[PDB]
């Protein structure tokens, strides 16, 4: 269920991050960051992605240093880094 403080695909911060809510429609494949292959890359397994951030819902969690807002686990951004990679 979408929080009010959802990071929208079209968020200004999202744009800066080249975030997508749905990683299967991210440029992640083009970016092909190291860690794991692009299709496995999403906020779900992003290095400093936090469940602990409060406000976090069903699909929605705290990204790294994305204050106030919550990203969708299924999403991705240019900063994506594996949990220990
Ligand atoms: S840094 Fe990670 S958790 Fe945050 S938006 Fe990017 S991929 Fe998602």
Swiss-Prot record:
GO terms for biological process: aerobic electron transport chain. GO terms for cellular component: periplasmic space. The keyword Signal applies. Keywords: 4Fe-4S, Electron transport, Iron, Iron-sulfur, Metal-binding, Periplasm, Signal, Transport. This is High-potential iron-sulfur protein. It comes from Allochromatium vinosum (strain ATCC 17899 / DSM 180 / NBRC 103801 / NCIMB 10441 / D). GO terms for molecular function: 4 iron, 4 sulfur cluster binding; electron transfer activity; metal ion binding. Belongs to the high-potential iron-sulfur protein (HiPIP) family. [4Fe-4S] cluster binds at residues 43, 46, 63, 77. It is found in: Periplasm. Homodimer. Specific class of high-redox-potential 4Fe-4S ferredoxins. Functions in anaerobic electron transport in most purple and in some other photosynthetic bacteria and in at least one genus (Paracoccus) of halophilic, denitrifying bacteria. The lineage of its organism: Bacteria, Pseudomonadati, Pseudomonadota, Gammaproteobacteria, Chromatiales.
């Amino acid at each position: 269920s979408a929080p009010a403080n959802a990071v929208a695909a079209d968020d200004a911060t999202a744009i800066a991050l080249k975030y997508n809510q749905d990683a299967t429609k991210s440029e992640r494949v083009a970016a092909a960051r190291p860690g794991l292959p692009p299709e496995e890359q999403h906020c779900a397994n992003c290095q400093f992605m936090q469940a602990d951030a409060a406000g976090a819902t069903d699909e929605w969690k705290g990204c790294q240093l994305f204050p106030g807002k919550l990203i969708n686990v299924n999403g991705w951004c240019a900063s994506w880094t594996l949990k220990a990679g």
